[PDB]
Scaffold this active site. Structure first.
Site, short mmCIF file in Angstrom:
data_model
loop_
_atom_site.label_atom_id
_atom_site.label_comp_id
_atom_site.label_asym_id
_atom_site.label_seq_id
_atom_site.Cartn_x
_atom_site.Cartn_y
_atom_site.Cartn_z
N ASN A 111 -9.01 5.19 3.34
CA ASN A 111 -9.66 6.25 2.57
C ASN A 111 -10.58 7.17 3.37
OD1 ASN A 111 -12.72 5.55 2.10
ND2 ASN A 111 -11.83 3.58 1.64
N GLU A 120 0.82 -1.20 0.00
CA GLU A 120 0.00 0.00 0.00
C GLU A 120 0.85 1.25 0.00
OE1 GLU A 120 -3.08 0.48 -0.64
OE2 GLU A 120 -4.10 -1.33 -0.07
N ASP A 172 -6.62 8.29 -0.08
CA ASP A 172 -6.14 7.22 0.78
C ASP A 172 -4.93 7.78 1.52
OD1 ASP A 172 -7.88 5.37 -0.68
OD2 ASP A 172 -6.48 5.83 -2.22
N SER A 196 -12.24 11.12 -2.89
CA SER A 196 -11.67 10.79 -1.60
C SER A 196 -10.17 10.57 -1.80
CB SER A 196 -12.37 9.54 -1.08
OG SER A 196 -12.15 8.38 -1.90
N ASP A 198 -13.31 9.32 -7.22
CA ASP A 198 -14.49 9.89 -6.56
C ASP A 198 -14.19 11.11 -5.68
OD1 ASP A 198 -13.17 8.07 -4.71
OD2 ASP A 198 -14.70 8.76 -3.35
N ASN A 250 -8.38 9.21 -5.07
CA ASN A 250 -9.24 8.26 -5.75
C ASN A 250 -10.13 9.10 -6.70
OD1 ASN A 250 -8.58 5.87 -3.96
ND2 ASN A 250 -9.69 6.98 -2.44
C1 LIG Z 1 -9.23 0.30 3.76
C2 LIG Z 1 -8.97 1.24 2.61
O1 LIG Z 1 -9.30 2.42 2.67
N1 LIG Z 1 -8.35 0.75 1.53
C3 LIG Z 1 -8.08 1.57 0.35
C4 LIG Z 1 -9.16 1.31 -0.69
O2 LIG Z 1 -10.43 1.69 -0.29
C5 LIG Z 1 -8.79 2.05 -1.96
O3 LIG Z 1 -9.80 1.59 -2.97
C6 LIG Z 1 -10.62 2.53 -3.72
O4 LIG Z 1 -11.41 3.11 -2.68
C7 LIG Z 1 -12.31 4.14 -3.09
C8 LIG Z 1 -13.15 4.59 -1.89
O5 LIG Z 1 -14.08 3.58 -1.54
C9 LIG Z 1 -13.17 3.62 -4.29
O6 LIG Z 1 -13.90 4.66 -4.88
C10 LIG Z 1 -12.30 3.07 -5.41
O7 LIG Z 1 -13.11 2.61 -6.45
C11 LIG Z 1 -11.41 1.99 -4.88
N2 LIG Z 1 -10.48 1.54 -5.94
C12 LIG Z 1 -10.23 0.29 -6.22
C13 LIG Z 1 -9.22 -0.05 -7.30
O8 LIG Z 1 -10.81 -0.61 -5.62
C14 LIG Z 1 -7.42 1.66 -2.47
C15 LIG Z 1 -6.98 2.46 -3.71
O9 LIG Z 1 -5.75 1.95 -4.20
O10 LIG Z 1 -6.47 1.90 -1.43
C16 LIG Z 1 -6.72 1.19 -0.19
O11 LIG Z 1 -6.68 -0.23 -0.42
#
Ligand SMILES: CC(=O)N[C@@H]1[C@@H](O)[C@H](O[C@@H]2O[C@H](CO)[C@@H](O)[C@H](O)[C@H]2NC(C)=O)[C@@H](CO)O[C@@H]1O
EC number: 3.2.1.17
Length: 129
Positions: free
Chosen positions: A59, A35, A52, A50, A48, A46
């Site tokens: 996120n 990560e 990370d 938000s 949308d 991201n």
């Molecule tokens: C626990 C956590 O926050 N993990 C992160 C993921 O949530 C992130 O994934 C992305 O999250 C956003 C918010 O929900 C989604 O809009 C987006 O589609 C999603 N992307 C994917 C590829 O699943 C992730 C991004 O690399 O980083 C942490 O794993």
């Protein structure tokens, strides 16, 4: 702060992550490596709107509030800046809340693509815990 692998393992072990909801310690060290490459300051936006944050890339849509994200649910009850600290306490307390969801550690996309299913015990090998 960029953590060393065994340094992070020891910090995570003292905060109760070993075998938290079935997941051995190496899962959490592997998740943090893919990560953020163990960097406490890592951030990624991201599509949308938000972002990370931190060593475990938590996120702001569901977990922390950064001010900049419309309708953050802030389930961990923390500002997202708390996740950028060299002290990982807030990140692991929040991580335990998200690993309590139905899909457990699959909420970390890097863990499910690069760590899940492999011999994750290798990530704590040679660490004095
Ligand atoms: C626990 C956590 O926050 N993990 C992160 C993921 O949530 C992130 O994934 C992305 O999250 C956003 C918010 O929900 C989604 O809009 C987006 O589609 C999603 N992307 C994917 C590829 O699943 C992730 C991004 O690399 O980083 C942490 O794993």
């Amino acid at each position: 702060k960029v953590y060393g692998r065994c340094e992070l393992a020891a910090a995570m072990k003292r905060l109760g992550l070993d075998n938290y909801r079935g997941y051995s310690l190496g899962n959490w060290v592997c998740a943090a490596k893919f990560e953020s490459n163990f960097n406490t300051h890592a951030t990624n936006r991201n599509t949308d709107g938000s972002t990370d944050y931190g060593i475990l890339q938590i996120n702001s849509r569901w977990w922390c509030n950064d001010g900049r994200t419309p309708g953050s649910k802030n389930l961990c009850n923390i500002p997202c800046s708390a996740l950028l600290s060299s002290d990982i306490t807030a990140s692991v307390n929040c991580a335990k809340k998200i690993a309590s969801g139905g899909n457990g550690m699959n909420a970390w996309v890097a863990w499910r693509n690069r760590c899940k299913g492999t011999d994750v015990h290798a990530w704590i090998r040679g660490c004095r815990l």
